Amino acid sequence: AHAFWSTQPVPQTEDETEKIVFAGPMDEPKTVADIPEEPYPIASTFEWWTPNMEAADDIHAIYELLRDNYVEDDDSMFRFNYSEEFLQWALCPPNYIPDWHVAVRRKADKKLLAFIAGVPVTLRMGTPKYMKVKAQEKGEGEEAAKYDEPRHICEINFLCVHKQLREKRLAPILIKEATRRVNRTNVWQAVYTAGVLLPTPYASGQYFHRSLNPEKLVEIRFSGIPAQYQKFQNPMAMLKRNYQLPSAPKNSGLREMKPSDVPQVRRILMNYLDSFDVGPVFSDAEISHYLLPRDGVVFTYVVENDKKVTDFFSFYRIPSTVIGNSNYNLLNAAYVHYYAATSIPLHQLILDLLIVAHSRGFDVCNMVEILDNRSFVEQLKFGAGDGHLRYYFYNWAYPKIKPSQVALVML
Ligand SMILES: CCCCCCCCCCCCCC(=O)SCCNC(=O)CCNC(=O)[C@H](O)C(C)(C)COP(=O)(O)OP(=O)(O)OC[C@H]1O[C@@H](n2cnc3c(N)ncnc32)[C@H](O)[C@@H]1OP(=O)(O)O
Ligand SMILES: CN1CCC(N(C)c2nc(N(C)CCC#N)c3ccccc3n2)CC1
Ligand SMILES: CN1CCC(N(C)c2nc(N(C)CCC#N)c3ccccc3n2)CC1
Ligand SMILES: [Mg+2]
C-alpha cells in the first residue's frame, strides 16, 4: 500500500503506534561517515538546486512554484499563496542550514519542478506525561526518561511537485535527498505536518475558523449561510451581525511587541509551553525571529500595564488565491501563532487578536486545536472545519498524544 513509506523509519500502523511506550529512535544508529557524500541519483534531464532564500530572486522562483502548485482544496477553489516575505521568514530562522532547502530543476531551461524545505528546531520530544506514569507503574522510569533532553532536529515544510510532474515518484526522491542532507549534518529526526493521512501520526487535530468578513467568505464560497439564518428576513445581515467585533482592542496596555520585550516574552512563553508534551524551545534570537512584528507576515502584541509585560499573542498571514470568482482574487487569512496569558483569561486575550486581525483587513482567523486553543472556541465563535492537521515524526517512536498536548505551531 505504501511503496515509499513502507521503506522508511516511521511507525507503519496505528496498531504498532499502540505498542509504543517510550520516545526514542526507530532506525539503526548511524554516523555522518555512513551517509553518502554524493547527492541521491536523479534522472539525467533533472538537477538538484539549492536556492539561496535570502536572495530575493531565488525566493521569487520558489514563491512562483508554490503559488501555482502548492496545497489546494479538492474543488480547486483556493490555493495557498505564501508571500515572498513569509517564505524568507519561515525558511531562514537563526542558524538555518542553507543545504536543507532542496529544489529540482529541469537542466535544459532550468524550469523549477519541485521543492522541499527543512529548518532547525529545538524540540522537547521525550516520553509524554501519561506514558511516564505508565513507566513508573512498571518500574521502567529510566528507559522512559532517556530522551527527555530537548533535541536539535529538522522541521520539514513546503514539499511541492509541479502539477505536470505529479504521480511520477518524484516526491520520494526529494524526501530521500532532503534526509541525506540533514543526516550529513548529524541530525536524525524530523517533525512534519500534513492534511493527508500517512504512516503514522503521533497526534491529529481539527482545524477551526473564525469568520471576520462573512459577506466575502460567503461570496467566495469559503463559507455558506447556515440554514438557521434562512428563518430571517435578511440572512446576510444577521450573519454579519453575529460575527461583528469591536473596532479597537479591549485590553488596556495592548501594544505591538518591540525588541526590548524579547526576554519577558521568552520567559512567559517558555513557562507556558513547558506544560505540553511536545513543544519547541526558543532562544532569545529565535523569539526575536519568530515573534517580532514583520510587515504582512507576522503580527505580535503584548499586554503591558505599569511597566510589566504580562501576556502576549501573535498571528501570521497566509493569503490564498481564489480561483475564478469575479469579485475577489484573494482570501486573507490570519493564523493563531504562539501566545501566553498570565493576567487575563485566554479568551480575553484572543478576542483582541480577532479585533486586530479584523481591523487589519483579514477575512478569517484559522487555527488547529493544539495548545489551549479549545479553551476559547465557543465564546469566540470559532467553528470546526473539515480539515485536520496530522503531526508526524521521522525516525522517532512516540506514543499517541492528544492535540492539546502539542505546542508546536507549524507554518
Ligand atoms: C532526518 C531528516 C528527515 C527529513 C525528511 C522527513 C520526511 C518529510 C516527509 C514530507 C513532509 C512534507 C510536509 C508537507 O509539506 S505537507 C504539504 C505537501 N504539499 C502539497 O500537498 C502540495 C500539492 N501536492 C503536491 O505537490 C504533490 O502531490 C506531493 C509533492 C505532495 C506528492 O507528489 P505526487 O503526488 O506527485 O506523488 P509522487 O508520485 O511523487 O509520490 C508518491 C508518494 O508520496 C507520498 N506523499 C504524498 N503526499 C505526501 C505528503 N504530503 N507528505 C509525505 N508524503 C507524501 C505518497 O503517500 C506516496 O508514497 P507511498 O504512499 O507510495 O509510500
Ligand atoms: C466546502 N468547502 C471546502 C473548501 C473551503 N476550505 C476551508 C479550504 N481552504 C483551503 N485553502 C487552500 C485556503 C484556506 C485558508 N486559509 C484548503 C486547502 C487544502 C485542503 C482543504 C482546504 N479547504 C471550505 C468550503
Ligand atoms: C504543512 N502545512 C500545509 C498547509 C497548512 N495550512 C496552512 C492549512 N491547511 C489546511 N488543511 C486542510 C491542511 C492542508 C495540508 N497539507 C487548512 C484548512 C482550512 C483553513 C486553513 C488551512 N491551512 C499548514 C502547514
Ligand atoms: Mg511525482
User: Cell 532517556 identifies what position?
Assistant: 146
CATH code at 1-411: 3.40.630.170
Of 174, 217, 245, 411, catalytic: 411
Is the CB of residue 166 below 6 angstroms from any atom belonging to ligand 1? yes
CB atoms within 10 A of CB 46: 18
- Whole-angstrom CA distances from 149 to 126, 133, 143, 186, 348 are 7, 18, 13, 17, 34
CB atoms within 10 A of CB 24: 17
What's the one-letter identity of residue 274?
Answer: D
Q: Give yes or no for a contact between 354 and 245, defined as CB atoms under 8 angstroms apart.
A: yes
What is the DSSP-derived secondary structure letter of residue 41?
Answer: P
Q: Give yes or no for a contact between 397 and 26, defined as CB atoms under 8 angstroms apart.
A: yes
Instruction: Looking at the CA of residue 387, tell me the nearest atom of ligand 3.
Output: 12
d(CA 223, CA 390): 23
Q: Give yes or no for a contact between 317 and 362, defined as CB atoms under 8 angstroms apart.
A: yes
Q: Is 31 helix (H, G, I), strand (E, B) or coil?
A: coil
Region of residue 183 (left: phi > 0; alpha: psi -120 to 50; beta: else): alpha
d(CA 332, CA 220): 12
Q: Give yes or no for a contact between 337 and 318, defined as CB atoms under 8 angstroms apart.
A: no
Beta strands (DSSP E) in 179-329 are 190-194, 203-211, 254-256, 279-280, 298-305, 308-322
Tell whether the torsion through CA atoms of 376, 378, 380 and 384 is positive or negative. positive
CB atoms within 10 A of CB 244: 10
The count of residues in the chain is 411
Q: Which three cell numbers stand for residue 351?
A: 478576542
Technique used to solve these coordinates: X-ray
| Reduced 3-state DSSP string for 191-209 | EEEECCCCCCCCEEEEEEE
Domain map of the chain by residue range? 1-411
Q: Give yes or no for a contact between 80 and 63, defined as CB atoms under 8 angstroms apart.
A: no
Residue 371 phi, psi (nearest 5): 55, -135
d(CA 359, CA 248): 8
Q: Which three cell numbers stand for residue 332?
A: 486573507
Is the CB of residue 77 below 6 angstroms from any atom belonging to ligand 3? no
Residue 362 phi, psi (nearest 5): -80, 145
Mutating to test ligand 1, I would choose from 10, 159, 169 the residue with most ligand atoms within 8 A of its C-beta, which is 159
Mutating to test ligand 3, I would choose from 75, 115, 196, 207 the residue with most ligand atoms within 8 A of its C-beta, which is 207
What's the one-letter identity of residue 209?
Answer: H
What's the CA-to-centroid distance between 370 and ligand 2, angstroms?
19
- Whole-angstrom CA distances from 183 to 31, 33, 180, 188, 266 are 8, 10, 5, 6, 30
What's the CA-to-centroid distance between 77 and ligand 2, angstroms?
8
Tell whether the torsion through CA atoms of 88, 92, 98 and 99 is positive or negative. negative
Q: Is 1 helix (H, G, I), strand (E, B) or coil?
A: coil
What is the DSSP-derived secondary structure letter of residue 115?
Answer: E
Q: Does an H or E element contain 154, and which?
A: strand 151-161
